[PDB]
């Protein structure tokens, strides 16, 4: 998968 | 990293902290379920160029997530190690994917052009030149490749090349590298920050690609541009290696 951190930086 | 942006959430789950035999903390990034990229340089600390993979592999200690210790089977070096500065570490088993631990995707597209911005994490030193007690991160713009070339050496044309490097040692600068500018607030990336990935978040398709890995982590305060080796250029090489 790409692009799905549980809590991104933003 | 000397300046700020404490890593509160763990927004960078693919960052691994590998410590060499003499307690030197260094960055490595988890590139897929079984493998993590790093630099040939990082691999070669406290070892001779004579040393081969079998020699180097048992020496290292590696950490993912918080303290999480993943073991390490073999080690493979880029055939151009002295020019393209890249290793690969294969982990003895799989790592459980979850919110804090998870590999990064290798990019198909190439975002090397100036005007883009990226995010570099790091475990490296700070403005007290202490190894940081907690992982941090910083945003950096990408810098004009010519300004960077003329910056670190003198030339363009290879016969006028001279060691203009603000620090003692000269960085590797070729067609497989790109340079990232200085911060907005003049923050930069120092000892220990090699092997961390220059990760650009693509907002339309919302994915974080690793465009480059940081090679030259010496620049710190003194040298206006950090320099990364594009991962896209080792694309077709890493795939060949994954099959073994």
């Amino acid at each position: 998968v790409c692009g799905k951190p549980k809590n991104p930086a933003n | 990293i000397l300046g700020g942006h404490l890593d509160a959430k763990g927004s960078f789950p693919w960052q691994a902290k590998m410590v060499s035999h003499h307690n030197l903390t260094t960055g490595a990034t988890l590139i897929n379920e079984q493998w993590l990229l790093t630099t040939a340089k990082n691999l070669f600390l406290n070892h001779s160029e004579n040393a081969t993979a079998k020699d180097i592999a048992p020496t290292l200690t590696l950490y993912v997530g918080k303290k999480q210790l993943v073991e390490i089977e073999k080690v493979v070096l880029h055939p151009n190690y002295s020019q393209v500065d890249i290793g690969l570490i294969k982990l003895k088993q799989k790592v459980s994917v979850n919110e804090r631990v998870m590999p990064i995707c290798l990019p198909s597209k190439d975002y090397a052009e100036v005007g883009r911005v990226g995010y570099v994490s790091g475990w490296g030193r700070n403005a007290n030149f202490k190894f940081t007690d907690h992982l941090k991160y910083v945003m950096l713009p990408v810098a004009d490749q010519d300004q960077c070339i003329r910056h670190y050496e003198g030339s363009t044309v290879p016969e006028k090349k001279t060691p203009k490097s603000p620090v003692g040692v000269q960085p590797i600068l070729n067609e497989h590298t790109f340079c990232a500018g200085m911060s907005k607030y003049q923050e930069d990336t120092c000892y220990g920050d090699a092997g961390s990935a220059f990760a650009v978040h693509d907002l339309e398709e919302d994915t974080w690609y690793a465009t480059g890995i940081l090679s030259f982590d010496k620049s710190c305060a003194v040298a206006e541009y950090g320099v990364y080796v594009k991962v896209t250029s080792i694309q077709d090489w890493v795939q060949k290696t994954i099959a073994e």
Binding site: - | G4, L6, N126, A127, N128, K130, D133, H134, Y185, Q186
Partner: protein, 146 residues
């Protein structure tokens, strides 16, 4: 940490003469000036770009005052350090996520501003004691990070 009586005595006796309406704010705005990236946390104040704006802006010294006080409270009872800064530690670490190393940098610029005002009478042993103090403070304030 433990401290022999004549360091604490030289510390408190020196701390009495320290002007409490200026020094703290000067240490803070100096940290802001020398390491401008901390402006990122305080930029609600106004223009922090030039040193003259920083030096003039009433909110810089207004904040510094509260910080200088908090440090006075630290220096008062140095044996129970954890509890006194426990709340400030929650404010800075959990909501703001200030990196604790800029605490020591500030403590150092403080001792610097101290030395600036106190000249030759601020001696290497007394400095070494204040270093011990701003250390113990930085540690207690950083204790909840592990």
């Amino acid at each position: 940490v433990h401290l022999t009586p004549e360091e604490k005595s030289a510390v408190t006796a020196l701390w009495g003469k320290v002007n409490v309406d200026e020094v703290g704010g000067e240490a803070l705005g100096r940290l802001l000036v020398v390491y401008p990236w901390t402006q990122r946390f305080f930029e609600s104040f106004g223009d922090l770009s030039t040193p003259d704006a920083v030096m003039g802006n009433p909110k810089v010294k207004a904040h510094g005052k509260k910080v200088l006080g908090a440090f006075s409270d630290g220096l008062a009872h140095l044996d129970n350090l954890k509890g006194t800064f426990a709340t400030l530690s929650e404010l800075h670490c959990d909501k703001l996520h200030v990196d604790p190393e800029n605490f020591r940098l500030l403590g150092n610029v403080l001792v610097c501003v101290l030395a600036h005002h106190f000249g030759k009478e601020f001696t290497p042993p007394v400095q070494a004691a204040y270093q011990k103090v701003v250390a113990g403070v930085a540690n207690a304030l950083a204790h909840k990070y592990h």
